[PDB]
């Protein structure tokens, strides 16, 4: 069924072994992790909690990666089956064979974590819904070029070549467009107006948690 | 050569001006600085009390001659341009032009065309500024909400930037989706680009960098 | 400044002439007209109000058309200047010359209407913001084709060729895509789910007036 | 000819079957109805208690032969196909194949290929169903809110329909914006298209219209 | 409703026909087989010696009603269509229509529209045949020579196939380069496609497969 | 400088070793090979020449592959440098070290072949110039579909969906277009007319060798 | 059948009236006009022939315009039918009615000209076949821009933005591409090499008349 | 940070250089003028008889550091870059690095990075020269013949210009058809563009305009 990215096998090894106290603090902190939090500030929360070890800290990527799976889980998919399917996949890529005690404790630890992966599921939902668009912005760059006006017996233009890099059809693409100084000003004003509108939409609808991924 | 019927009244008017008024029009067109629009040329005539309302009404037609001066064949005298324009007006006059008016028109267009040097530079700049694969026209941002539905409230604010541009002489739309951080980073790049323009102006201080108006 | 579509000159003629009572009822009804109402149900509201005549009814297109202008009107554009600029444009396309009394009454009547064009301005804003997208849907059609599977010594496919007609870059365009029976079912389910989500978004946010243009 | 290393175990297994098991595999593959997926072929072997787990493990490899049967040169005997496959397996066996196994493999593939007639029809249908300029894969709708900001609350609900399709062997996205009425009218057309399919099935009742699985 | 000024003479003419002529027009339009063009409808009127030249001159206008019958709202009587057309003609008559002619036109259009059933099917086929992403219009092949220049005579013959098509209601060109073998293989596929059409006609023998004309 | 496709190292091994008689027959046959001949009919010519062995036959791909290099060779690129650059590259991918006698004989044999690779260079030139187009045809397929005309109380269309597969921008692409029966006939006539024009262009210009690659 | 561009009705008026001597010289000169000659050098040939009048000179556009029709004329289309169909169309756009004598003389004069329109038919064939391409060049322009390299405590690039204007799908389009100085040099060399190849193709195949339209 | 296995030998080599050799490498890299390619850097090391073959073998790896210097976070010391590179090498050393070599590598990379200022400018120019919507790579012209077939010899010579370019990080082809006059006019514009470049160099004489190599 599942196949585990080879670099996460280290984190499942750790996860089969976390102490029943430590796994509960680690799952507790995961549930406390607010929606939109990236893995590095989940790591930072682990690294500072004096109840969580360096081993828990090293498991953060594996735990956080389950959010990509959690979006598939139906209303009647049981988390026990998920914890076992991940446990059987983990064992199948050993050259050792995983002892039954380690197997049981891993199923339990993953299940305990999956029970608390609620805001993590919302974080992967937010991340995919943010990029469900025809053209998702990634970066911009502006070249500020000079175009000299040649004469028939000292005059010139400055052209702002805006590059937008975007994803469309899962493909990295670039759009170039030519702006004068006044175009750059009026586009800056529309961008400012859209930020002003974002702050208005947050003060209204103040009962919605609006999410930033970065 | 043909004259658009939009401007026939202006060649008529311009054929009717005094040597004093037309000499003042040409000198004023010569002082008009490169990058000046027709509104500033009209404004400058209006404030000169030795140019009439007929001179002011000619100003839009005169400013159009900046374009033709880009198209002329390089061996042509401006006198052949003035004659060709005058016949192209007379051809549109179903009432036949007076011989006095034909002389005055060739004279008046040619005296103007002699000072059209900055008008030519102004139209070169207009051409060269839009000699680009995609030319910006307008921008608009739709600040949309996308709610995150749980299976059993949380949401995204998505900035849908619309860029309107000309390409292949065609008017087109580019939509792209930005979050708050993307909007700041795009704004930060635009500022940095405006700073770069001011640097290229502070260096290269002997080049006049012109803004279209 | 302005130029008036030749067929609306009839409606300005009527509008210069509505009775001070009738113009106030007509502007009152305009302000009562809810956002998203099209001109034909503004006409229908006029046609039924026993205080508004057949002449008011014939003016409805001209009044309703001002909403396209009202989106340009700045915070310090005065409605008097709008009413006069429309009045000077109206007179300039007469072959008669408009008498001063008719001019004054038209400025007043248009201004009285423009003061009540609030939900009409929102209706034109809604209409433009609804079509501010890369591809605005206009129509769909499905061809239900048969593709026979030929054999080497009675079997076939049914292919649902969905056509979407859309506007992009102000251009009328068509997109064809090929669906099997199961694709048509799963797309129908996503469309149903999106309608369910629209009804949820209306019950939440029940303090927002959500607008349909048709 | 080459065998993908994904299926080498299946030719090995299939070379190891009894004449009884392989005769039952071929007959069962012959009864498998057109449009059956490999899951149904596997399921049908599993429930036949005279086919082994080795037979069940061969089923994915056998079902792949439906594709090759579309590519074969029309004068070829299925016996030349079986030999070419057997050499293409032996070429991948760095441990050299037994002569008994070479006979059994050519025999076992050929007995199967003799009954692959509905498997060929099933793969024709798969090809012909995706022989289209744009083939549907998935749909998703984002129900977004677009607030109408007054200069001094009102909003639009916009259904952003995403269609995912294959074109030019490439995976692509088409986004289109719908209002509530557009979504109903599109749904109404889909229903009408499903009704048309049932009519084409009720008429033309002697054609088997197959669904891919 | 509006009438194009191209056809006003035809509604005029058609308003002027006898109950005998108009009954013969409708019956003849009813016998006209699906897929018949206006040339065949004109030809069939011409050879019927009880239809006049005025009937023949009406034929192009009548054939245009096949299109409108695709656009009508399904609850409408054909009598409301005939009235709406008659007012749309009277609206274009700056000389006002006689009341007798208004009755005769509603009568004459409605008697025709009653037999337009195969004309409707003919226009459905026209629509459905061009309800495609790219519709063929024309082909042309340029047989070009490309010489192989040695550094110190040999050449390629390249068949530049041009396909002209409609897409997005726009007229477009597709050029593709073929060698001699590609041209034969493309020709071989077209023949095989024509054979497949004749098979689908020999089977399904109770379906009328219509050609546009 | 060069790097040798690992499967051609076998053919260079053979080529370092062909007998001075056999290499001259093999190069002689290569020069006799007419422009447009593919490797399999070069192989077939080797396989039948009673002076060329099975070893020569196994070298045909390596010899024929030099035509892709021969298009780069300038007016003052010496074939000795080519034969050595290929010989030094061959040795560099051994785990053995190639003996000097084998090195000298390979340089000589390759040089003798390269001196006779004239029509082979024209064959690679022909092959590249044939595909120097915006859209190079690879294959066509026609689906012969039925489109039924539904009615409001037994009529249908047959639509020939022609697929052309082509290369553009080094990318495999497909173009679908819809034809009726008469379109298929008129396109067939234009294709026939273009074949007739090819035969005319060959009878005129009968002093040009016109090349087919397949 | 035909409809005549309103400005060519003047030339048919002249053509109905040319003298039997003059029409034969005018058709004789047309047959002498070499393939690729434009109308202005047909006019120039008329203007200098002392047997052709100013009236013949004014007819040159109408005569030359028949080449666009002549490409449609089949192997069994008779020129008499063409001359009459053009004559009946000419008369139908008079407000006068054309006298029978004028009608007969026009049919004869056009037919006499059409009999000599051979190189004119080749000139319209050449003109259409020259533009039977995916992208027909119309104009180029290069902007020579400066791109300054900014620094972190006097260096720059010159970028040659080549614009090609072309027709594709009957649409006026532009392609911009960015070149450095060396790209401009190497493209110039390929263009020179293609001109050298054109001169070679003319010296070989010296029995073909190679045509330039401009 | 990761090192590509293509360059691991170069960090190894570079970790093994003397303070004398590495000081000469850095100074020489500092004198290398902006726009110099790695071939000229290699050539300049080779001719300096106080740099070894190991120094010459390091040159390709050093020249690659111009790229990383565009990506560094602006607050970073070059010392943190050198450490990060050294750990990224040690991470790829399955045989563990000596502590002496770790010091020498951080030292040797940092002494080089101190003089990489013109290497940074050289890589900026490379980036900025290809920061364009379509970047030229190659051109080719096919001089084709198109014979004019009479119904009962004459021909066109058509110059098929192919431009190869990068767009969207993708390699693409633009074909356009030119006649002899179009080819001359395009050549005339290119010359005029080269003249304009020399003018922009003769004016603006205090700017170094660099050519990529």
């Amino acid at each position: 069924k599942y196949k585990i990215p080879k670099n996460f096998l280290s984190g499942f090894q750790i996860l089969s072994q976390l102490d029943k106290k430590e796994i509960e603090e680690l799952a507790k902190l995961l549930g406390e992790l607010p929606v939109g939090s990236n893995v590095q500030e989940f790591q930072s929360a682990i690294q500072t909690n004096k109840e969580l070890s360096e081993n828990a800290l090293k498991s953060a990527d594996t735990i956080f990666s389950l959010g990509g799976l959690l979006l598939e889980i139906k209303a009647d998919d049981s988390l026990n089956q998920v914890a076992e399917d991940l446990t059987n996949a983990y064992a199948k890529e050993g050259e050792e064979e995983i002892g039954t005690e380690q197997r049981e404790q891993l199923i339990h630890n993953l299940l305990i974590v999956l029970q608390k992966a609620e805001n993590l599921k919302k974080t992967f939902k937010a991340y995919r819904l943010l990029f469900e668009n025809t053209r998702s912005f990634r970066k911009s760059r502006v070249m500020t070029d000079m175009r000299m006006i040649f004469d028939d017996d000292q005059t010139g233009l400055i052209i702002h070549q805006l590059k937008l890099e975007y994803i469309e059809d899962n493909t990295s693409k670039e759009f170039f467009i030519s702006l004068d100084n006044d175009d750059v000003l009026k586009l800056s004003e529309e961008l400012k107006r859209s930020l002003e509108k974002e702050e208005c939409i947050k003060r209204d609808f103040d009962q919605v948690q609006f999410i930033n991924i970065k």
Side-chain angles (χ1 to χ4, degrees), chain A residues 2-131:
Chain A
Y2 301 103
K3 179 263 178 170
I4 292 142
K6 180 173 53 64
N7 61 295
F8 299 155
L9 294 170
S10 61
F12 285 110
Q13 189 178 268
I14 297 188
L15 285 181
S16 78
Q17 179 150 327
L18 296 183
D19 168 9
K20 288 291 183 81
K21 84 188 257 148
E22 193 173 6
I23 188 71
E24 194 67 63
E25 268 287 314
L26 182 57
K28 169 215 141 285
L29 188 182
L30 185 67
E32 288 183 322
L33 197 80
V35 182
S37 302
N38 90 303
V39 76
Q40 307 199 12
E41 54 205 334
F42 180 46
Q43 285 168 337
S44 302
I46 295 163
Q47 181 173 4
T48 177
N49 184 354
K50 292 184 181 346
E51 304 186 50
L52 296 181
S53 69
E54 213 205 43
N55 263 339
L57 182 98
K58 293 207 254 202
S59 150
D61 286 59
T62 296
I63 302 183
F64 203 93
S65 75
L66 302 183
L69 171 79
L70 276 168
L71 294 180
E72 85 89 5
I73 300 310
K74 304 293 186 178
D76 83 342
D77 278 310
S78 73
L79 298 184
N80 284 84
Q81 276 155 41
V82 178
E84 177 140 25
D85 289 340
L86 290 171
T87 295
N88 282 323
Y90 168 73
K92 176 188 77 223
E93 281 109 290
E95 292 291 346
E96 75 277 36
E97 184 63 34
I98 299 299
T100 315
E101 278 63 346
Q102 311 293 15
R103 204 180 301 235
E104 290 295 337
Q105 191 172 144
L106 181 58
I107 288 176
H108 188 266
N109 283 346
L110 283 176
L111 188 281
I112 292 296
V113 166
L114 288 165
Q115 284 172 0
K116 292 316 299 293
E118 177 56 34
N119 291 0
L120 181 70
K121 188 180 173 194
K122 283 186 168 81
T123 297
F124 275 83
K125 193 50 185 254
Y127 177 51
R128 295 197 185 175
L129 282 173
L130 185 60
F131 284 82

